[PDB]
Amino acid sequence: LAFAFMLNTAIQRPGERVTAEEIRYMAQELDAGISGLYSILSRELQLPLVRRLIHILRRKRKLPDFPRSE
Amino acid sequence: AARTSFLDAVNRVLQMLGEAPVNSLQGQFGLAKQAEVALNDVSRTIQTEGWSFNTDLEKKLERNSSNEIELSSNVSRVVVDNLEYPDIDVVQRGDKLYDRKNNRYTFDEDLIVDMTTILEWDLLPEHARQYITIKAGRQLQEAIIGSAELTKLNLTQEVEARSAFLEEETTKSEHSMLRGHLNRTSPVNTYIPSRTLE
Amino acid sequence: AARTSFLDAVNRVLQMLGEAPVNSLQGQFGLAKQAEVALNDVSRTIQTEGWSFNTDLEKKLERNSSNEIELSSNVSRVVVDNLEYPDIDVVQRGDKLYDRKNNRYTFDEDLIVDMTTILEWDLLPEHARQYITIKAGRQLQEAIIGSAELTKLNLTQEVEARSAFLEEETTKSEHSMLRGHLNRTSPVNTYIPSRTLE
Amino acid sequence: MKTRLTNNVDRQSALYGSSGGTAAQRYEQLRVDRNSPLKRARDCSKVTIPGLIEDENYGDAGRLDTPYQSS
Amino acid sequence: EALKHLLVGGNVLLYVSDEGIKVIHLDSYVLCRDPMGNVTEIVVEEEIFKDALPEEYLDEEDDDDDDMGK
Amino acid sequence: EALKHLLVGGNVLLYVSDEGIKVIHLDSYVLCRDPMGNVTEIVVEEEIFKDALPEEYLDEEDDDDDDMGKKMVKIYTCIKFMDDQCHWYQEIKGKEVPGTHGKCAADVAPWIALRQDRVDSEMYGRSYVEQYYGDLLALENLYKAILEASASLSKVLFLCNPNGTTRPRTLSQASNGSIVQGNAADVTVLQAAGKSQDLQIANQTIERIENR
Amino acid sequence: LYKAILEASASLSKVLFLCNPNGTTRPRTLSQASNGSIVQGNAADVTVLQAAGKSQDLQIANQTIERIENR
Amino acid sequence: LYKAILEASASLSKVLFLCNPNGTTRPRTLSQASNGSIVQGNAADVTVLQAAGKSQDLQIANQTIERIENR
């Protein structure tokens, strides 16, 4: 379960030294483990939020309208 | 080849005792009365313990007009789950149930109990009949003749009969430990590790 | 086949001693009265211990006018709770309680005790009846004949009967080790470590 | 007083009325389908964090339990 | 807070405004989707004290009660 | 997402457009291939609410329904590959939707088909996890087995020897630190004498399978 | 050989309970009793079925399998 | 020598069960019973066939084959 939830405790190997390169390697593993969730959240939350943000900002007239393609 | 009957059982008991076989049961002029009483007593002694062939689950009991629970005269034991009823501790006393915790003979509602009954000779299954016959023969011989070699022979036969009866009971009733208390409806699958690894 | 009755018990004791069966129990002309006495004595000896079926919990006891506690004719043992009564601890003496700490026969208020009673033959349950029968028969045979091999056989039967009686008692009553002294109401759920892991 | 749970950026004039039912009726209709996932989420929350998602009668005067593991 | 609810529950509805961002738990809204994945209608239900509502919407029975704070 | 479906399932169909990339699961399209490997025809079936459809194509029965937010209409798609120029059109209820036609060369086609393991003479490929499905199943079964054995073992009971002189009431009712009448040799605890070795063997084989 | 060792390990993982008839333990008492309870019986009677000595042969098979795999 | 040790390990890997007739264990009960159940028997009767001592000779063979391979 600890490996599944990507906590840092299961990372330690008791008894012998671990190199910095090894630590970076398994840190790469943990970052890779939740790539699907990062991707789906990036597609779903960030873009609509910022789009609504710019729309509200433009309606407030604090910045002139974006140029549009001819 | 039908199942063993009362006359065959008493003939077997007499043969174990060492006497000549007797013809009938009615108006007998032999040891028939002693053999019959030994058979009945051993049947009762075996049956009062409670097995899987004479026990009713989640049976409902009804009180009389005075809020008293009266049992039948052939009820050997009554068990009431503690977790279900956390305010009453019931024990059997004669033919009526008694409230040990509250020191009363009167209740407030009907109960759901697990009770066992003493069955007649006709309704017993084959292994019970066999074990009862052998035990009754041993008891009668030991209490009536009292020799040595006969006692040891009957001891060996009774040991073998007990082993056979226990094995038959366990394989018929499939007792388990994962299931827990049998009162619950089976949620178990007993997924065997032996089969599905291919 | 009903529960064991008094006449059947007397007949069984006489049979295991070695005598012929008797027809009734009233106005007889044999050892039936001695068998009755032996059965009653063994019943008293067994019941003076305190088991599930003959113990009353939480019972309230009432004093008389002279500030004394009076016990009935058939009260065997009386237990008080030290944690509930710190300045009074009592011990039964004859038929009256005696405040051994204050060296007085009087009290100041009504007590809450746990009482053990000696019951008649009617109110006894089946396993207790069987144990009483076997033990009384063995004791009477030893007192009358005075054998050794017969005593050995009776000891074997008595050991088996005691095992069965203890089995039945501990299955019926459902004693626990977590719960502690039972004068506290059950908070215990005993959730099964066995089944519910799926 | 002034019910302002909505911004002042896109408010307009009245454009739709009550042409067919009320919002309460549609909410009651859709609660039937919404039921089960709420139960699943409530059980999961109970097994991880006792008081995150709550039953409707465990608010001001409700008591929460604790698990026997903190993973 | 939205991320925590998403991890525990799996569904959460956001409202983006000039004043702030308000989250609504799964217990206080409903919706319908096509099997493609495009949502069509959302109903959100919430409960408030009568003090913040317009007086024209305050009926006689609410006026007849002495529990405006309850 | 497409790569994840490719590893898990082994097939996925892509559509490329200026607006965005849309993936389609294996469960919503069919296709035919020559044994050479060139796909000839693709059919895509898809389900959408009736609100986004043209009103002329809304039938009387759909108009008679008050479940417009809960009633649905299927929309199909057909793909043909010939003379290195693909052709496609959208249809609904057996007639084509106006303005949905398209045509472009094969090398710039908008539809792309994939398969994990290039196994010839198969219309649909094989997923990667199919390689080790059996070992995965065996590992699953062995893990559950050891878990169930441990579940059965962890129970604790007590046992009184009838030949002894220990009363259950005395043991249960007595408080902590007291002195009672009994012999410690009679009361025993139910336990499994030797089962450790087999469990260690099972642990060893599970570790080997998991490491592989 | 891998199949063989997996097969033997699968067979050995079963767990059973065995009660000696010469004793005074009833199966119903063992099955029905709740946790922490105290019942009548002798722990020397109930036994669990197991393979007495098999570790040596399996370790030999593991050694030869490891050698072949290394080669 | 490699073939010899491989064949010996092949023969040793088999597993069998053996019931003692003097005991009171029925094969049908052992085979048919499900996991975790309680049946009638004595664990001292059912034994598994094994080779008592062969590890020393196999170790001698391993030593000599290692020496030959090293040479």
Side-chain angles (χ1 to χ4, degrees):
Chain A
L1 244 198
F3 229 82
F5 271 73
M6 91 67 61
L7 312 98
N8 284 201
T9 312
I11 289 163
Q12 161 83 320
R13 322 292 290 272
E16 318 235 12
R17 264 175 137 185
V18 277
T19 75
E21 203 168 353
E22 273 175 310
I23 283 162
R24 192 186 50 73
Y25 214 39
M26 336 190 314
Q28 273 196 339
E29 178 182 1
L30 278 315
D31 178 277
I34 307 300
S35 182
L37 199 50
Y38 315 132
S39 97
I40 181 178
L41 269 283
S42 92
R43 177 258 162 280
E44 185 57 281
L45 188 97
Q46 276 167 319
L47 159 75
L49 186 155
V50 62
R51 264 213 271 262
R52 168 63 164 170
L53 224 63
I54 313 135
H55 172 84
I56 276 175
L57 171 147
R58 169 196 276 104
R59 185 48 57 76
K60 197 58 73 63
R61 274 211 163 94
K62 295 165 145 287
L63 161 73
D65 314 316
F66 263 126
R68 83 181 328 169
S69 167
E70 307 171 354
Chain B
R3 274 148 268 158
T4 297
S5 78
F6 202 39
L7 270 285
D8 294 82
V10 55
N11 265 315
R12 186 53 153 89
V13 169
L14 282 201
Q15 193 195 264
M16 179 159 347
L17 190 43
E19 308 292 73
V22 83
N23 245 338
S24 181
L25 174 60
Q26 198 48 46
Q28 298 321 115
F29 292 75
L31 311 93
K33 282 168 239 275
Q34 306 270 289
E36 142 167 344
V37 84
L39 256 172
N40 287 322
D41 259 349
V42 170
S43 167
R44 183 166 39 239
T45 284
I46 289 292
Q47 232 161 337
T48 171
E49 193 156 3
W51 299 102
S52 80
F53 64 87
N54 68 338
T55 286
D56 314 328
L57 266 298
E58 64 106 25
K59 194 143 160 41
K60 168 106 161 305
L61 272 174
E62 272 320 280
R63 42 202 193 147
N64 61 1
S65 60
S66 296
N67 299 276
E68 269 182 296
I69 309 290
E70 267 164 293
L71 293 199
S72 315
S73 180
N74 60 346
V75 181
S76 164
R77 53 198 283 283
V78 167
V79 190
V80 162
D81 169 85
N82 256 16
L83 269 300
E84 282 269 17
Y85 302 169
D87 217 10
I88 310 181
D89 194 24
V90 281
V91 298
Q92 163 156 255
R93 262 187 186 167
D95 40 356
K96 340 177 98 187
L97 307 190
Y98 177 90
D99 189 321
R100 180 153 76 101
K101 173 71 83 60
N102 278 357
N103 312 265
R104 314 195 274 96
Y105 270 93
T106 78
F107 292 84
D108 270 338
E109 44 165 346
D110 325 296
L111 310 181
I112 309 303
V113 312
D114 303 358
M115 106 188 80
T116 84
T117 42
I118 296 202
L119 276 281
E120 280 202 330
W121 174 272
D122 182 353
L123 294 180
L124 303 178
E126 177 60 42
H127 50 95
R129 278 173 198 192
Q130 294 281 244
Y131 188 52
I132 272 165
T133 290
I134 290 201
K135 267 251 282 198
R138 185 270 279 259
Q139 208 168 75
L140 198 34
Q141 192 283 326
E142 186 148 7
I144 281 303
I145 307 314
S147 169
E149 78 302 334
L150 279 172
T151 313
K152 78 174 38 38
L153 305 188
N154 307 340
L155 252 193
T156 64
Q157 275 187 36
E158 176 266 2
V159 157
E160 206 170 9
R162 152 146 279 248
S163 159
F165 165 78
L166 218 51
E167 160 293 333
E168 181 46 3
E169 171 78 0
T170 189
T171 190
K172 218 183 257 189
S173 190
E174 61 284 359
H175 318 113
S176 179
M177 267 210 192
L178 286 211
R179 184 151 135 68
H181 72 67
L182 269 64
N183 163 275
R184 201 206 318 130
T185 314
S186 288
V188 75
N189 209 151
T190 68
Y191 212 59
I192 73 199
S194 50
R195 160 69 272 166
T196 310
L197 263 74
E198 330 300 330
Chain C
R3 269 158 287 146
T4 312
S5 88
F6 204 31
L7 169 67
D8 313 298
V10 181
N11 261 264
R12 159 74 208 211
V13 168
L14 272 201
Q15 193 249 43
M16 162 165 98
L17 159 69
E19 303 276 348
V22 79
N23 219 337
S24 176
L25 77 79
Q26 193 44 10
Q28 307 311 132
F29 329 107
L31 283 182
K33 289 164 244 282
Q34 291 225 310
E36 280 212 348
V37 172
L39 257 73
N40 291 334
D41 199 331
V42 170
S43 173
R44 167 190 324 160
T45 291
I46 283 286
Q47 303 197 332
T48 185
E49 264 214 64
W51 305 95
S52 74
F53 62 88
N54 69 339
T55 280
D56 312 1
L57 289 153
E58 183 261 1
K59 175 85 139 190
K60 171 157 211 279
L61 227 49
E62 207 139 55
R63 50 196 200 153
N64 68 352
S65 70
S66 298
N67 292 276
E68 281 186 339
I69 320 299
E70 280 301 273
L71 301 181
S72 310
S73 84
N74 58 340
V75 171
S76 168
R77 83 187 239 266
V78 165
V79 190
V80 296
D81 215 339
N82 196 284
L83 268 284
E84 191 68 356
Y85 294 88
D87 79 272
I88 308 181
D89 63 62
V90 313
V91 293
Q92 157 167 247
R93 273 197 189 175
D95 50 321
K96 309 209 281 223
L97 308 178
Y98 176 37
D99 189 352
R100 82 184 259 198
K101 169 83 136 52
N102 273 350
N103 323 54
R104 304 203 269 94
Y105 269 98
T106 76
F107 294 88
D108 221 41
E109 84 280 45
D110 257 323
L111 297 198
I112 313 297
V113 279
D114 313 278
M115 217 149 52
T116 306
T117 314
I118 283 168
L119 300 178
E120 312 271 1
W121 175 270
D122 166 337
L123 310 177
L124 270 164
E126 177 60 53
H127 52 277
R129 285 186 199 202
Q130 307 287 290
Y131 192 39
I132 289 306
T133 292
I134 295 204
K135 179 147 201 172
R138 167 205 170 228
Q139 141 171 344
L140 184 55
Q141 169 291 346
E142 168 295 296
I144 281 290
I145 285 274
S147 155
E149 295 72 5
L150 291 182
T151 303
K152 211 207 322 299
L153 311 181
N154 297 329
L155 267 201
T156 302
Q157 266 146 45
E158 199 262 353
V159 161
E160 206 285 332
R162 157 163 257 259
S163 293
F165 157 89
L166 229 43
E167 155 50 283
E168 174 58 31
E169 201 74 15
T170 190
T171 299
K172 192 191 308 271
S173 189
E174 209 277 310
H175 324 81
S176 188
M177 177 75 108
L178 296 202
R179 202 154 101 81
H181 66 320
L182 322 180
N183 254 43
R184 198 224 324 121
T185 303
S186 297
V188 51
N189 165 278
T190 42
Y191 210 36
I192 46 185
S194 55
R195 174 66 285 207
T196 310
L197 311 198
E198 278 60 29
Chain D
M1 310 196 229
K2 267 195 173 182
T3 68
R4 277 197 191 169
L5 299 164
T6 56
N7 55 349
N8 317 64
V9 193
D10 279 315
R11 343 180 173 266
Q12 230 165 56
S13 48
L15 199 78
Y16 326 79
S18 67
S19 57
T22 77
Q25 274 152 338
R26 286 178 250 162
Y27 183 83
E28 190 96 359
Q29 262 181 69
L30 301 198
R31 166 160 44 184
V32 161
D33 84 78
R34 196 252 306 193
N35 195 4
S36 150
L38 178 61
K39 144 79 61 183
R40 283 212 276 285
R42 158 174 314 135
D43 269 26
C44 294
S45 152
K46 150 188 312 308
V47 79
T48 169
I49 289 185
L52 203 140
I53 287 199
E54 83 298 345
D55 189 2
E56 42 270 6
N57 298 322
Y58 274 116
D60 314 343
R63 159 145 187 139
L64 284 319
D65 203 326
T66 165
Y68 302 141
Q69 45 85 30
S70 88
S71 291
Chain E
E1 209 267 359
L3 261 294
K4 176 193 281 189
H5 261 63
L6 196 72
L7 271 283
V8 159
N11 297 263
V12 60
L13 162 62
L14 276 187
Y15 173 64
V16 166
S17 192
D18 179 21
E19 312 315 305
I21 320 175
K22 164 189 304 147
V23 311
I24 293 99
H25 298 0
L26 170 61
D27 47 23
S28 306
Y29 73 93
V30 288
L31 56 101
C32 278
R33 318 175 77 261
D34 49 16
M36 218 148 163
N38 312 35
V39 77
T40 62
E41 166 173 37
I42 275 162
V43 184
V44 180
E45 183 270 293
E46 60 246 40
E47 151 176 340
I48 216 158
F49 265 123
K50 327 159 293 306
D51 75 83
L53 311 175
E55 296 189 2
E56 66 189 335
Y57 287 96
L58 296 182
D59 310 327
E60 296 186 356
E61 288 177 0
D62 296 320
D63 288 327
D64 287 331
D65 282 311
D66 284 321
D67 266 354
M68 41 297 302
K70 297 187 200 140
Chain F
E1 204 269 357
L3 260 293
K4 182 192 282 187
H5 270 57
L6 199 76
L7 281 317
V8 158
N11 297 263
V12 55
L13 161 62
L14 276 190
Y15 176 66
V16 167
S17 92
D18 37 12
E19 311 316 305
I21 311 204
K22 163 185 304 147
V23 315
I24 296 100
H25 298 356
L26 169 60
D27 52 29
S28 309
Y29 72 94
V30 294
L31 58 94
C32 281
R33 316 175 77 261
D34 46 21
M36 201 96 88
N38 332 296
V39 159
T40 66
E41 164 176 33
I42 275 144
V43 187
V44 181
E45 183 272 291
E46 208 289 330
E47 145 49 359
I48 186 175
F49 267 127
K50 330 159 296 307
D51 300 51
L53 316 176
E55 301 192 3
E56 43 278 24
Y57 285 89
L58 298 183
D59 315 329
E60 302 182 0
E61 292 172 358
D62 292 321
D63 280 328
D64 285 326
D65 284 310
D66 282 325
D67 262 352
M68 158 163 53
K70 299 183 203 139
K71 286 208 169 195
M72 38 209 79
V73 157
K74 314 262 211 203
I75 165 169
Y76 284 68
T77 311
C78 178
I79 314 282
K80 298 204 176 183
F81 271 89
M82 31 175 68
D83 55 85
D84 60 73
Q85 320 193 9
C86 37
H87 271 118
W88 67 85
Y89 60 88
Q90 255 167 64
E91 92 206 348
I92 169 175
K93 206 63 57 65
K95 65 188 289 326
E96 91 163 19
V97 199
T100 48
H101 205 102
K103 183 212 51 183
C104 94
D107 58 333
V108 300
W111 318 79
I112 295 93
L114 295 74
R115 67 197 324 192
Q116 163 71 5
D117 181 15
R118 181 70 141 73
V119 195
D120 265 11
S121 89
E122 279 160 20
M123 297 206 173
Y124 303 87
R126 334 289 293 213
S127 45
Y128 177 84
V129 202
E130 164 94 353
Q131 276 263 37
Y132 311 96
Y133 171 71
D135 294 353
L136 202 48
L137 196 150
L139 190 147
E140 150 69 44
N141 197 289
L142 270 191
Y143 265 155
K144 147 177 192 295
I146 171 177
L147 171 135
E148 172 176 90
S150 161
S152 152
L153 273 203
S154 285
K155 198 180 191 186
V156 49
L157 269 161
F158 275 105
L159 276 193
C160 283
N161 193 10
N163 290 15
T165 48
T166 49
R167 310 311 205 288
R169 315 294 336 277
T170 301
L171 268 42
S172 157
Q173 194 98 356
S175 62
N176 191 6
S178 162
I179 288 175
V180 308
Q181 179 277 316
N183 201 355
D186 321 83
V187 160
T188 56
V189 176
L190 155 74
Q191 86 291 13
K195 258 282 149 163
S196 54
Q197 282 69 11
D198 317 330
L199 263 297
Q200 268 101 34
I201 288 177
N203 285 282
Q204 287 156 241
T205 191
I206 278 174
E207 278 186 358
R208 184 181 301 300
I209 293 285
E210 186 276 338
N211 192 297
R212 176 149 66 68
Chain G
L1 274 191
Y2 257 74
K3 154 163 171 275
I5 172 186
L6 176 141
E7 166 58 274
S9 158
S11 184
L12 278 198
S13 183
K14 201 176 193 184
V15 48
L16 272 159
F17 278 102
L18 253 71
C19 52
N20 190 13
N22 286 16
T24 48
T25 52
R26 315 311 201 286
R28 310 296 332 281
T29 298
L30 309 190
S31 157
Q32 200 97 355
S34 61
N35 194 8
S37 162
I38 166 154
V39 304
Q40 176 273 310
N42 196 356
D45 308 355
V46 163
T47 52
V48 177
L49 153 77
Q50 84 288 17
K54 203 79 213 163
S55 56
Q56 279 67 12
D57 315 330
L58 271 43
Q59 93 170 311
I60 279 179
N62 284 281
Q63 281 156 236
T64 187
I65 274 176
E66 205 283 339
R67 184 191 298 293
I68 291 281
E69 202 295 339
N70 187 295
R71 176 139 71 72
Chain H
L1 267 189
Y2 255 87
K3 139 162 187 301
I5 171 179
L6 172 136
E7 171 206 280
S9 159
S11 153
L12 271 202
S13 281
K14 199 179 191 186
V15 53
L16 265 162
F17 276 100
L18 253 73
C19 288
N20 195 10
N22 289 15
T24 48
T25 53
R26 313 311 204 286
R28 312 295 334 278
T29 297
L30 276 39
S31 158
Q32 193 97 355
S34 61
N35 190 6
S37 161
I38 274 182
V39 308
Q40 183 279 316
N42 199 356
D45 311 294
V46 170
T47 58
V48 176
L49 154 74
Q50 84 290 10
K54 280 305 290 221
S55 56
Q56 283 69 12
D57 317 329
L58 266 295
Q59 272 142 30
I60 284 177
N62 286 281
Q63 287 156 240
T64 182
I65 178 64
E66 277 187 358
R67 164 181 320 300
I68 294 285
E69 181 295 339
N70 191 297
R71 178 146 66 70

